[PDB]
Design a protein around this motif. Structure first.
Motif, PDB file in Angstrom:
ATOM      1  N   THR A   5      42.709  41.805  31.878  1.00  0.00           N
ATOM      2  CA  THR A   5      44.114  42.070  31.603  1.00  0.00           C
ATOM      3  C   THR A   5      44.645  43.498  31.658  1.00  0.00           C
ATOM      4  O   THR A   5      43.902  44.464  31.511  1.00  0.00           O
ATOM      5  CB  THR A   5      44.481  41.453  30.241  1.00  0.00           C
ATOM      6  N   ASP A   6      45.952  43.606  31.890  1.00  0.00           N
ATOM      7  CA  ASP A   6      46.641  44.889  31.937  1.00  0.00           C
ATOM      8  C   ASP A   6      46.970  45.249  30.492  1.00  0.00           C
ATOM      9  O   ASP A   6      47.536  44.440  29.759  1.00  0.00           O
ATOM     10  CB  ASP A   6      47.935  44.777  32.753  1.00  0.00           C
ATOM     11  N   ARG A  63      45.876  43.399  38.383  1.00  0.00           N
ATOM     12  CA  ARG A  63      45.892  43.142  39.821  1.00  0.00           C
ATOM     13  C   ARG A  63      44.641  42.457  40.362  1.00  0.00           C
ATOM     14  O   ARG A  63      44.726  41.417  41.020  1.00  0.00           O
ATOM     15  CB  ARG A  63      46.119  44.448  40.581  1.00  0.00           C
ATOM     16  N   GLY A  64      43.480  43.042  40.094  1.00  0.00           N
ATOM     17  CA  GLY A  64      42.236  42.470  40.580  1.00  0.00           C
ATOM     18  C   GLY A  64      42.028  41.013  40.217  1.00  0.00           C
ATOM     19  O   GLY A  64      41.691  40.191  41.071  1.00  0.00           O
ATOM     20  N   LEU A 105      42.865  34.979  41.587  1.00  0.00           N
ATOM     21  CA  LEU A 105      43.511  33.689  41.311  1.00  0.00           C
ATOM     22  C   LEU A 105      44.390  33.270  42.489  1.00  0.00           C
ATOM     23  O   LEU A 105      44.466  32.083  42.834  1.00  0.00           O
ATOM     24  CB  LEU A 105      44.349  33.775  40.032  1.00  0.00           C
ATOM     25  N   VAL A 106      45.059  34.238  43.105  1.00  0.00           N
ATOM     26  CA  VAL A 106      45.883  33.946  44.284  1.00  0.00           C
ATOM     27  C   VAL A 106      44.974  33.404  45.383  1.00  0.00           C
ATOM     28  O   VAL A 106      45.295  32.423  46.051  1.00  0.00           O
ATOM     29  CB  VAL A 106      46.580  35.220  44.825  1.00  0.00           C
ATOM     30  N   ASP A 107      43.835  34.055  45.573  1.00  0.00           N
ATOM     31  CA  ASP A 107      42.875  33.637  46.586  1.00  0.00           C
ATOM     32  C   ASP A 107      42.355  32.233  46.269  1.00  0.00           C
ATOM     33  O   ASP A 107      42.192  31.409  47.176  1.00  0.00           O
ATOM     34  CB  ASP A 107      41.720  34.647  46.654  1.00  0.00           C
ATOM     35  N   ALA A 108      42.116  31.953  44.991  1.00  0.00           N
ATOM     36  CA  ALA A 108      41.622  30.635  44.591  1.00  0.00           C
ATOM     37  C   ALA A 108      42.667  29.565  44.891  1.00  0.00           C
ATOM     38  O   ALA A 108      42.333  28.479  45.385  1.00  0.00           O
ATOM     39  CB  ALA A 108      41.272  30.627  43.111  1.00  0.00           C
ATOM     40  N   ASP A 151      51.312  28.311  35.201  1.00  0.00           N
ATOM     41  CA  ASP A 151      51.727  29.325  36.176  1.00  0.00           C
ATOM     42  C   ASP A 151      50.895  30.552  35.804  1.00  0.00           C
ATOM     43  O   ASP A 151      50.493  30.687  34.653  1.00  0.00           O
ATOM     44  CB  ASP A 151      53.215  29.682  36.027  1.00  0.00           C
ATOM     45  N   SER A 152      50.646  31.452  36.749  1.00  0.00           N
ATOM     46  CA  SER A 152      49.850  32.636  36.452  1.00  0.00           C
ATOM     47  C   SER A 152      50.564  33.926  36.819  1.00  0.00           C
ATOM     48  O   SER A 152      50.799  34.200  37.993  1.00  0.00           O
ATOM     49  CB  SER A 152      48.508  32.555  37.182  1.00  0.00           C
ATOM     50  N   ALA A 153      50.904  34.718  35.807  1.00  0.00           N
ATOM     51  CA  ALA A 153      51.596  35.985  36.036  1.00  0.00           C
ATOM     52  C   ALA A 153      50.649  37.174  35.968  1.00  0.00           C
ATOM     53  O   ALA A 153      49.684  37.177  35.198  1.00  0.00           O
ATOM     54  CB  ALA A 153      52.710  36.153  35.022  1.00  0.00           C
ATOM     55  N   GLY A 154      50.925  38.191  36.775  1.00  0.00           N
ATOM     56  CA  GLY A 154      50.080  39.364  36.764  1.00  0.00           C
ATOM     57  C   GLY A 154      50.888  40.615  37.020  1.00  0.00           C
ATOM     58  O   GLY A 154      51.981  40.554  37.583  1.00  0.00           O
ATOM     59  N   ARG A 155      50.377  41.754  36.571  1.00  0.00           N
ATOM     60  CA  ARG A 155      51.073  43.005  36.825  1.00  0.00           C
ATOM     61  C   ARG A 155      50.369  43.541  38.051  1.00  0.00           C
ATOM     62  O   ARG A 155      49.222  43.989  37.992  1.00  0.00           O
ATOM     63  CB  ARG A 155      50.925  43.993  35.675  1.00  0.00           C
ATOM     64  N   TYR A 156      51.062  43.486  39.174  1.00  0.00           N
ATOM     65  CA  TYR A 156      50.493  43.908  40.432  1.00  0.00           C
ATOM     66  C   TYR A 156      50.418  45.428  40.601  1.00  0.00           C
ATOM     67  O   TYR A 156      49.425  45.955  41.078  1.00  0.00           O
ATOM     68  CB  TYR A 156      51.305  43.271  41.548  1.00  0.00           C
TER      69      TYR A 156
END
Ligand SMILES: Nc1nc2c(ncn2[C@@H]2O[C@@H]3COP(=O)(O)O[C@H]4[C@@H](O)[C@H](n5cnc6c(=O)[nH]c(N)nc65)O[C@@H]4COP(=O)(O)O[C@H]3[C@H]2O)c(=O)[nH]1
Ligand SMILES: Nc1nc2c(ncn2[C@@H]2O[C@@H]3COP(=O)(O)O[C@H]4[C@@H](O)[C@H](n5cnc6c(=O)[nH]c(N)nc65)O[C@@H]4COP(=O)(O)O[C@H]3[C@H]2O)c(=O)[nH]1
Length: 166
Positions: free
Chosen positions: A6-7, A15-16, A21-24, A77-82
């Motif tokens: 986590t951020d 991001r990592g 997760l995006v790739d999954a 849904d999955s949120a991330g700080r890019y």
């Protein structure tokens, strides 16, 4: 200790981890073809906001944005700080038109917000880009690219808006 994922400032995925997760989700789509969309959004006029009210104010704007996001999306849904003022959300089982709904709800929640900071009372907006995954992207990064392109169009097209990638 889920600190590796986590951020710190926002509490969202970093991001990592988010990209993993995006790739999954991308590979799940390549296998099953489910409707799935990606959102990439930025805080409008961030540098100007930061310069004018100070970095502490800027952090509060970032934290509020993350809070609005966290409290407005499904646990599925999955949120991330890019990046610095950039965020991303994975929306599984959600097509482009449906993604616009959650995005608009977030856009409006941010638009109606007032960040009470020690420097002053701030109002800001976000620009958002949506890209439903099709068979075209050859890897998850090309999918992210489409959402990022939609985001740029939203910014160039007037800001404080949601744009769906065509
Ligand atoms: N307008 C709107 N807002 C949305 C939608 N999806 C998610 N949200 C917002 O984001 C939060 C998502 O919660 P959740 O993790 O899916 O967890 C949810 C959800 O899993 C369950 N729930 C509530 N209503 C429904 C429903 O109508 N259908 C289903 N399947 N589950 C629901 O209880 C929890 C209630 O959460 P909330 O307090 O409502 O807080 C919700 C909600 O206000 C949506 O489709 N439309
Ligand atoms: N992945 C994702 N997709 C989203 C989200 N918000 C909206 N959508 C998509 O866009 C449609 C929005 O419907 P709505 O106008 O909010 O109208 C919604 C909503 O107002 C209500 N509802 C469903 N779930 C919840 C919930 O969890 N909380 C609340 N407060 N209301 C809900 O019932 C309707 C159900 O609509 P759907 O059939 O689910 O179809 C939904 C949904 O699939 C989101 O946060 N995450």
């Amino acid at each position: 200790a889920k600190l590796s994922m986590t951020d710190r400032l926002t509490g969202l995925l970093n991001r990592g981890t988010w990209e993993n997760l995006v790739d999954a989700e991308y590979e799940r789509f390549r296998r099953y073809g489910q409707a799935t969309s990606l959102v990439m959004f930025d805080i409008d006029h961030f540098k100007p906001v930061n310069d004018t009210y100070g970095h502490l104010a800027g952090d509060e704007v970032i934290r509020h944005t993350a809070d609005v996001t966290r409290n407005n999306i499904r646990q599925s849904d999955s949120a991330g700080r890019y990046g610095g003022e950039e965020f991303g959300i994975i929306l599984p089982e959600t097509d482009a038109e449906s993604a616009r709904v959650i995005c608009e709800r977030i856009r409006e929640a941010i638009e109606k917000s007032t960040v009470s900071t020690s420097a002053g009372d701030i109002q800001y907006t976000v620009s958002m880009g949506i890209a439903q995954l099709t068979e075209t992207p050859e890897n998850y990064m090309q999918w992210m690219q489409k959402a990022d392109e939609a985001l740029y169009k939203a910014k160039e097209s007037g800001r404080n808006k949601v744009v769906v990638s065509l």
